[PDB]
Amino acid sequence: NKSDAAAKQIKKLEEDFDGRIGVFAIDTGSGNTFGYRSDERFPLCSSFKGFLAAAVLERVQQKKLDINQKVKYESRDLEYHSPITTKYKGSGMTLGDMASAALQYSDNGATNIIMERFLGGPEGMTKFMRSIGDNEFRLDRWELELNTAIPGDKRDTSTPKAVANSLNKLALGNVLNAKVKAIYQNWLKGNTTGDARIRASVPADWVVGDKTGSCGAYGTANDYAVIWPKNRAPLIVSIYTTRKSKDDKHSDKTIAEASRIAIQAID
Numbered sequence: 001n002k003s004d005a006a007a008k009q010i011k012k013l014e015e016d017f018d019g020r021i022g023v024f025a026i027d028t029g030s031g032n033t034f035g036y037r038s039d040e041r042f043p044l045c046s047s048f049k050g051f052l053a054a055a056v057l058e059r060v061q062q063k064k065l066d067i068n069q070k071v072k073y074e075s076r077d078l079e080y081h082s083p084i085t086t087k088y089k090g091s092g093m094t095l096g097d098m099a100s101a102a103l104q105y106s107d108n109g110a111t112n113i114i115m116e117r118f119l120g121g122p123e124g125m126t127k128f129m130r131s132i133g134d135n136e137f138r139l140d141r142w143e144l145e146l147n148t149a150i151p152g153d154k155r156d157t158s159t160p161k162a163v164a165n166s167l168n169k170l171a172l173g174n175v176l177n178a179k180v181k182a183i184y185q186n187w188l189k190g191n192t193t194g195d196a197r198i199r200a201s202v203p204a205d206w207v208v209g210d211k212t213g214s215c216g217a218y219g220t221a222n223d224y225a226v227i228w229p230k231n232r233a234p235l236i237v238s239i240y241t242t243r244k245s246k247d248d249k250h251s252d253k254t255i256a257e258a259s260r261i262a263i264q265a266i267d
């Protein structure tokens with residue numbers, strides 16, 4: 001009833017913007033869930049940089065990488081949208097600072113360096129997600145080519161559900177020890193690109209961590225979040241969208257509204 005209506009709201013919302021919306025929301029207290037197109041495929045865009053930061057932390061934790069290790073790149077042609085790597089280029093950044101920049105500012109340079117040097121490229125990225133029991137997620141290509149978001153292209157996609165479950169595992173589950181879990185949570189919390197998405201759908205006094213993607217093509221944008229309400233168990237939210245025509249612009253407000261809806265459905 002509280003779910004059959006939630007779905008109606010989402011279908012109307014996708015029709016409204018001539019597009020396609022995928023949702024998965026978990027209440028980790030009640031075990032309640034809500035889902036619309038949650039097993040349909042959607043492009044990741046930048047949103048996997050959230051999971052890359054987690055992969056770095058797992059390595060870090062196995063004492064295969066030092067979080068404080070200097071990463072040099074003074075002679076690199078930094079990819080477009082590297083706002084943070086660009087500033088430190090003359091001096092390198094720690095591994096920690098590089099991963100968090102991948103997450104928090106969606107920095108392409110940080111992303112690519114980490115995938116090449118420490119994680120085994122996209123295949124390694126996909127392996128890491130398998131290692132935690134995510135079967136849907138796939139990363140095929142690098143920045144920025146992975147952002148094409150061409151309809152029916154399965155490269156570099158996942159499902160809203162697979163994304164949610166995964167976030168749950170990494171942010172709230174037992175893939176990371178207490179120390180590194182806390183860093184991960186902090187990183188998520190300090191994401192700077194998500195104020196118009198899932199965060200705009202919740203009271204100001206809930207803490208949120210999130211990772212957004214914006215493919216910049218076929219109106220494809222997304223956001224995922226861990227939400228900690230005041231007197232309540234953490235929520236997980238997962239919003240994925242595409243649009244019909246290559247030129248369609250992405251809709252921040254549609255993501256926020258889909259977040260409003262999902263949250264009400266698991267409440």
Ligand SMILES: *[B@@]1([O])OC2=C([C]=[C]C(F)=C2C([O])=O)[C]2[C][C]21
Nearest residue numbers: 045046081106193212213214215
């Ligand atoms: B990406 O998918 O992430 C991204 C880009 C541009 C602007 C954005 F706001 C964001 C985001 O939301 O993470 C480009 C780098 C790709």
Ligand SMILES: [Cl-]
Nearest residue numbers: 104105106193
């Ligand atoms: Cl970001």
Ligand SMILES: [Cl-]
Nearest residue numbers: 170173175176
């Ligand atoms: Cl964890």
